[PDB]
Symmetry: D2
Subunit: 293 residues, 4 copies
């Protein structure tokens, strides 16, 4: 398996006005990430790709398009989690067949699952596909002791590589890197990249890398080298941009920024607001002028 | 449209060991509810039916089976909500075509939706199907004032009939019944049936009515008549049973209780633990002896 | 022992502009509650009396004044809880010496205390004073079994009479009455009086009874009689008043309502805003016109 | 002004078996911190000093003893916050008269205060004492823009120097340094010292520095120098010790660790468990053997 460390953009998907996938636009998003953002890889089918609002067939179409466009140019991780474990296995088999470098899967949601149920979910996707797996932060933890024990149980299956860490708990992060040093951690909070990199995370998966990949790489590399003053200056500008994106509407703003760079990033998928308002477009133009020009 | 007030069992589904639907067992669950539990209706495809772990085709199969088995004997509500609005419209059209009396839909989940997005979701399902709709408690409310305003906006579409109330806020419940007296409220907390009925809820949708329908009807009717001392005695026994069911595993325990009554309630669907442990079966036998014998 | 069931106003305290106690105004509030609100008793030194913003000497002054003004006309409960257990024992001894009918004490706060620490706190106040005690809802519970288990442990002390229930969990409320039927429960949510009375609470302790005591008694007695239609109409009017009070500022609005009836309820104590704005006074007059005229 | 940057131990207080202050033991704790832990200063009267369980006179006694023992050898900050603003002003005046270098004050608690009330509280303590102030993280925030907005409002008072940051939000931490670069931030989470120092905090206030001050200074200074590999190794050992301390009981374990070094750290104050169990003492000795020998 290919090196999975580094900067991964969580791939946004271009949709048409009617909610269908715009394949031409999706390929332009992929090309922008590989050629201009210079990412180490793409994280396909995650939250950022508006994955959970789509059919199984649409998810397969996006996996097809991303692998065909990226080829072997960069590493590709396929997020295949679902509340439906049979769907997660089907998507995991498909992504495996397409050649994805590894799978990832959100914790099953909508119902409250016990830890044994979550571990069985991951072990089943791994056993049925034969692919390695990146897990997600374990929900509803009451303590770090329990958190480390549970990662330790997930981490009994040798095909579990590590975790996409979204919890805002740097104590737990430090504990996990100490207890399981050979397992990888990818930061899942772009606005907290510096402190995560200071604790030795192995990479980052993020939605804002679709437009801010240059600064994201700089923060990560400078931090690993101990150049914290400069890394913080770049995190400050990055977070001014991220604060504006969050206030204006996360996926719509990143798509509107991509449109200003000549990428046909399209609409969002309903039930999310599909069309950016004039105000949202106006704010996206201002953010591009201030931070990406 | 048929009367939708009263006691609705949230229909459990029988699954085989491999996770597929057991149609014979599902028909036995339906017959037990209509003939023995004497419910006013069934709420099909809800959380209790393990709906969100299933494919769209499986959901359609369950809607087919429930309508064919129940015919016009009782009222039938179809829960068709999803994170995928195109799926919710497809399921809503199918349930409408089958003759369901009304639709219901959970709030779109997994992402955080704004109120306008939630209202557009409901208005879209209604517009595309032509069916009336029961909404779910609005998530993440910061106040009752906002809650009532938002119900008031949902309640601008004349085809929204009312709400399946799951929030444990009887102040909000009272406010909603006062502000919108012609809109219905169904209690969605079996262990809080008495206090809900004391505030004039119009019915209840519940998972434990699959086995405790007799007491549920008694609590509801006695409470509406002002016979609170007796209603509370029956709520006390009901809650001893419900406390045992919750501690032992909700859907598995209700299925194990149904098996003790000769109903082939089957297994649960994975990622939920599919097979009851010997201990879980043992606890289900004890609950049946104490409360349903 | 002096009967502690029924309607208890959580006594408000009148403060001067400089924050000192206005004894004449406090006596007028007491007289209003006894003579006009027709309460069964007063709950002195609770949250509503702005107790936690005061010195130990000020708390003693309020206990002295309330007992001297009320004499033996009504029941009197003294809230003496604190984060400082030595202070709670001092106040408990003083209220006992003055003749208060029972003590009550908030769970020790600020810090996170274990259940054994909370039980030792209550047992210490009781042992050092010789007085009966009303406890408060146990915080940070994870389940009803454990909540009930812990109330059981508190109730092993025969001098613990019951609880002032503020938690918004009517399943827990029902479980408490099921488990410990001889122990008392006072509702601590005025806007949820009807549903609480439907579950058998023995009385209610509330801030709004200082001005709405007549309706509060009607809701309680009508609900106990099973006259739910009439009780619900009075709860509806009551909750229109409570909604307005809460939106305008709880403490300041009840004091302004008392001022309009000729009770010198004075200012609030800092760090709470001490004086009402012109807009707050205008809204309070509108509430008086609509609901207390 | 006296430099307030660097490592500040949140001073523990020694209590006798009866809960009274053990002045000799308190002086030994102070001496240990100054002479052995090599702290830059002490934070007196905070959570760690068990302040909120004490009377106003006891708080004054601790302020007197700490200033008399420390004299002018180190920097001294006095935490004087309370729910009682008159008490906070009294304590602020006393600590100012004694020569403390700065005041600090927890957000008023128990009740829910508005932002204007919190700002008036801080402005009142400052105006009545003439002393500089360190505020606490603002509670119940809904967003970073509003959190930053409110710190801006507090910082309009030139005597507010910065904040003791306890919130577990490093995005907010970064936004605070971006917005108000000349204002100070002290980290209040010992186990997250490295990532906090990576974001430019100016110092740290902690309970574990009473026994782990040598490593705490190394983490802070190494991180500021960009020596992350070395700082992370020391944070790893530190967090092994902190994890054990937290699991065994924070207050009691640090006092037992001090007792093993010959410091009469005494008992804890009730309502906290005053004496360690045999198991707690055994575990504390194991922690001393492994990490402080
Ligand atoms: C919840 C969320 O959005 N998390 C993103 C992680 C990307 C990811 O793993 C995914 O899309 O599944 C972050 O990039 C995030 O968008 C960004 O930090 C802004 O908050
Ligand atoms: C969250 C949950 O389980 N709610 C049930 C409501 C049923 C319902 O509307 C559904 O299945 O969608 C209740 O019957 C519940 O199972 C029962 O009260 C036990 O807690
Ligand atoms: C949190 C709070 O204010 N609870 C009150 C209970 C009063 C009480 O027991 C006290 O003052 O200690 C209620 O009366 C409340 O004021 C009222 O229901 C309006 O919300
Ligand atoms: C909540 C708490 O205890 N916070 C401490 C900060 C100490 C402080 O500022 C105080 O005592 O007021 C931390 O040192 C903490 O004890 C330590 O990080 C272990 O969790
Ligand atoms: Cl490892
Ligand atoms: Cl209406």
């Amino acid at each position: 398996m290919r090196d999975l460390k580094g900067i991964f953009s969580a791939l946004l998907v271009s949709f048409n006005e009617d909610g269908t996938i715009n394949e031409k636009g999706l390929r332009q998003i992929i090309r922008h990430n590989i050629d201009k953002m210079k990412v180490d890889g793409l994280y396909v089918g995650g939250s950022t790709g508006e994955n959970f609002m789509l059919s199984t067939e649409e998810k397969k179409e996006i996996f097809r398009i991303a692998k065909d466009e990226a080829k072997d140019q960069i590493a590709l991780i396929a997020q295949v989690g679902s509340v439906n474990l049979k769907e997660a296995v089907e998507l995991g088999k498909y992504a495996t067949e397409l050649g994805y470098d590894c799978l990832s899967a959100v914790t099953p949601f909508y119902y409250k699952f016990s830890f044994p149920e979550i571990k069985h979910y991951y072990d089943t996707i791994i056993a049925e596909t034969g692919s390695n797996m990146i897990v997600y932060s374990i929900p509803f933890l009451t303590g770090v002791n329990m958190g480390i024990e549970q990662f330790g149980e997930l981490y009994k299956n040798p095909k579990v590589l590590g975790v996409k860490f979204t919890a805002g708990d740097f104590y737990l992060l430090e504990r996990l890197k100490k207890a399981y040093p050979n397992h990888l951690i990818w930061a899942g909070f772009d606005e907290m990249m510096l402190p995560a990199a200071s604790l030795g995370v192995d990479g980052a998966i993020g939605s804002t890398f679709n437009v801010n990949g240059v600064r994201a790489r700089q923060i990560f590399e400078l931090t690993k080298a101990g150049k914290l003053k400069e890394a913080l200056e770049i995190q400050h500008v990055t977070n001014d941009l991220i604060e504006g994106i969050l206030a204006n509407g996360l996926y719509l703003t990143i798509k509107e920024l991509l449109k200003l760079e000549g990428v046909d990033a399209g609409y969002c998928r309903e039930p999310m607001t599909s069309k950016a308002t004039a105000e949202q477009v106006a704010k996206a133009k201002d953010l591009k002028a201030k931070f990406l020009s």
